[PDB]
Amino acid sequence: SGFRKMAFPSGKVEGCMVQVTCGTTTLNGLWLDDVVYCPRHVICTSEDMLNPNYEDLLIRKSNHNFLVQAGNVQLRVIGHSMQNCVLKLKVDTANPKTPKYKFVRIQPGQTFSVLACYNGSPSGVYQCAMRPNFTIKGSFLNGSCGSVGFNIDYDCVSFCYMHHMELPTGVHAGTDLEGNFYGPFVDRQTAQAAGTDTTITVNVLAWLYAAVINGDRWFLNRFTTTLNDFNLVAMKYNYEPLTQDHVDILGPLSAQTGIAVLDMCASLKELLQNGMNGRTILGSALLEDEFTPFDVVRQCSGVTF
Amino acid sequence: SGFRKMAFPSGKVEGCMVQVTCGTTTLNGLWLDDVVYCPRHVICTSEDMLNPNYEDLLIRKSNHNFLVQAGNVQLRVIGHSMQNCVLKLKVDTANPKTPKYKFVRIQPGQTFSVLACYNGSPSGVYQCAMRPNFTIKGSFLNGSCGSVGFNIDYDCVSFCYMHHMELPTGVHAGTDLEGNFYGPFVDRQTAQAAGTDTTITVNVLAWLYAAVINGDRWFLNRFTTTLNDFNLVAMKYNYEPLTQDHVDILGPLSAQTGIAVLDMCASLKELLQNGMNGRTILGSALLEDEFTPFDVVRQCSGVTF
Ligand SMILES: O=C1C[C@@H](C(=O)Nc2cccc(Cl)c2)c2ccccc21
Numbered sequence: 001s002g003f004r005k006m007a008f009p010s011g012k013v014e015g016c017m018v019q020v021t022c023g024t025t026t027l028n029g030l031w032l033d034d035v036v037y038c039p040r041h042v043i044c045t046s047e048d049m050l051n052p053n054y055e056d057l058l059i060r061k062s063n064h065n066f067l068v069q070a071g072n073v074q075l076r077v078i079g080h081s082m083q084n085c086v087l088k089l090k091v092d093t094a095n096p097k098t099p100k101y102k103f104v105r106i107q108p109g110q111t112f113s114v115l116a117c118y119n120g121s122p123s124g125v126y127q128c129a130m131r132p133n134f135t136i137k138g139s140f141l142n143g144s145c146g147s148v149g150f151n152i153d154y155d156c157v158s159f160c161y162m163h164h165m166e167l168p169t170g171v172h173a174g175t176d177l178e179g180n181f182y183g184p185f186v187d188r189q190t191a192q193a194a195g196t197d198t199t200i201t202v203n204v205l206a207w208l209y210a211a212v213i214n215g216d217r218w219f220l221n222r223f224t225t226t227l228n229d230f231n232l233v234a235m236k237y238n239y240e241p242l243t244q245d246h247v248d249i250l251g252p253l254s255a256q257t258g259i260a261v262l263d264m265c266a267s268l269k270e271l272l273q274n275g276m277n278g279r280t281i282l283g284s285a286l287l288e289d290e291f292t293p294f295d296v297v298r299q300c301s302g303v304t305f
Numbered sequence: 306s307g308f309r310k311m312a313f314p315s316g317k318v319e320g321c322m323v324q325v326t327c328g329t330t331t332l333n334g335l336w337l338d339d340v341v342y343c344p345r346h347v348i349c350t351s352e353d354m355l356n357p358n359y360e361d362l363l364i365r366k367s368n369h370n371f372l373v374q375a376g377n378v379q380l381r382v383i384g385h386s387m388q389n390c391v392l393k394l395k396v397d398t399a400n401p402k403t404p405k406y407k408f409v410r411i412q413p414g415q416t417f418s419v420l421a422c423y424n425g426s427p428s429g430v431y432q433c434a435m436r437p438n439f440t441i442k443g444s445f446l447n448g449s450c451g452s453v454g455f456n457i458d459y460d461c462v463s464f465c466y467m468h469h470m471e472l473p474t475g476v477h478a479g480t481d482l483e484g485n486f487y488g489p490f491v492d493r494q495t496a497q498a499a500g501t502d503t504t505i506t507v508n509v510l511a512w513l514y515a516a517v518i519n520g521d522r523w524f525l526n527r528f529t530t531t532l533n534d535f536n537l538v539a540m541k542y543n544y545e546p547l548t549q550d551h552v553d554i555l556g557p558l559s560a561q562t563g564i565a566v567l568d569m570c571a572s573l574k575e576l577l578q579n580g581m582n583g584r585t586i587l588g589s590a591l592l593e594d595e596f597t598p599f600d601v602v603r604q605c606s607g608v609t610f
């Protein structure tokens with residue numbers, strides 16, 4: 001028993017991290033097969049960041065201007081191309097540590113592990129969620145750009161996130177591995193609206209099921225509700241509306257616990273309306289929304305990679 | 306910016322995990338050089354667990370009774386010995402993936418990463434603290450025994466914890482890598498008192514400094530206190546007494562922020578006495594005690610391994 005915010009084991013990804021330098025800028029890249037992927041803003045100077053002309057800046061660069069180092073080992077760059085907001089540096093050596101992998105574009109409310117890196121070297125790993133507003137609440141310093149987010153299924157790493165930017169509000173923005181930003185963001189040093197966030201309702205419900213499995217049951221009540229009634233409450237409290245698709249995804253946890261999804265919604269409604277009265281659930285005094293239903297089952301059933 | 310409960314990158318440790326089977330019991334072991342370390346209760350049956358005679362049970366076992374498998378690869382066992390509550394299985398092959406490593410016995414209130422494993426395969430990684438009462442609040446299912454906790458400094462893994470047991474209270478107990486339990490616990494299926502826990506005061510203060518660095522400043526007040534006055538409050542709220550050694554360890558964070566340690570103690574005193582009034586600090590509605598002062602600096606300064 002017990003319930004923790006658990007990340008994927010990071011080893012498969014650690015073997016793909018390299019350092020990329022262009023001029024006086026160093027950040028991280030991801031070495032898969034004979035391609036290194038990194039944020040395109042490695043080519044910028046400080047005077048460029050206000051609104052870089054990336055096409056013009058990249059024209060000034062040649063293969064030999066990109067220094068790519070894998071531990072102590074220098075890689076030879078034989079092509080470069082820009083795809084959306086990422087560069088792809090073709091190298092003459094396939095990464096011998098390449099895992100089975102996929103590039104995926106994840107949906108808001110899904111979770112993944114981030115391997116924070118500096119100078120192509122891993123510093124730590126943590127789990128987070130893609131917010132409904134397509135930001136992430138990470139832990140990232142200067143030099144972290146190019147760090148990646150991922151999920152693992154058996155032996156296959158699905159890469160979903162590459163870090164690009166900290167917004168002036170202190171939350172984080174980045175792209176999929178084809179260089180497309182999540183959200184409306186652009187890679188320049190400007191104030192940029194993220195727009196209203198909401199709490200991930202289906203994840204909160206998943207975590208309440210995890211609480212029950214773990215014996216934290218005090219918040220279970222004598223009430224039920226309807227999707228319509230609950231969604232009125234969801235609206236007031238800036239929660240995502242719950243759909244039947246969400247109910248369907250919660251089915252396995254409902255079955256395990258014997259607690260109908262709408263009964264659990266009625267518990268959540270009461271917590272929203274009354275607060276926690278100085279109590280905790282799974283070690284938290286807030287309602288936690290960074291665990292998906294898949295996350296809860298995986299952790300509660302001991303799936304390995 | 307941002308502050309997360311970040312684990313060490315787990316790759317160096319993933320390469321040391323193996324499966325150990327003895328009779329009908331399977332758990333995890335740690336393969337370093339030509340020794341595999343695992344919990345001694347791998348030799349028990351269900352009828353033994355109430356109070357195993359480990360010496361007598363082990364006499365019945367020979368080298369060939371210990372099946373050790375490293376991925377798909379079977380290791381040949383050429384010696385066995387029991388040290389305290391661990392077995393050491395000598396194998397004929399040094400682990401080629403052995404990192405630089407040390408065995409350390411950590412102090413209560415220190416933190417480490419746990420790599421949860423089943424059948425010798427990694428499932429996830431998370432950070433936690435050794436509680437003042439020498440328990441850990443982990444996430445562990447049947448089959449997790451032999452999973453390890455560790456810290457990394459540059460290229461050296463310091464192993465501090467091996468998982469043995471979930472107590473009836475749902476918290477976790479285990480040993481150092483010489484097989485000595487943390488706390489009063491014994492490896493048998495009995496109710497066992499853990500005794501009063503307390504909150505790790507120096508860690509709470511460290512996290513309040515992390516909050517300030519990150520711009521969460523609302524809890525800073527106009528007050529100061531003394532060690533004596535603060536410790537009276539600590540007592541009432543089941544916090545560890547603060548010592549000058551703790552003040553000394555908080556020195557670097559005091560200097561960074563310009564906030565005297567006893568001023569920060571006065572902030573904490575007010576939070577203890579008044580609660581948070583429905584506010585949050587670094588995403589938490591409780592006072593967090595699982596970050597050491599070293600943790601805060603490391604995360605806030607981007608140290609890599
Ligand atoms: O998390 C990050 C990445 C780095 C960043 O924000 N770069 C940046 C800033 C504006 C525009 C563009 Cl394209 C990149 C940084 C600098 C300081 C602290 C944290 C962090």
Ligand SMILES: O=C1C[C@@H](C(=O)Nc2cccc(Cl)c2)c2ccccc21
Pocket residue numbers: 001346354445446447448449450469470471472477491492493494495
């Ligand atoms: O976290 C653990 C390890 C495993 C355990 O508790 N084993 C055990 C139980 C009593 C005595 C001794 Cl020596 C070992 C377990 C079983 C069920 C759920 C969680 C967990």
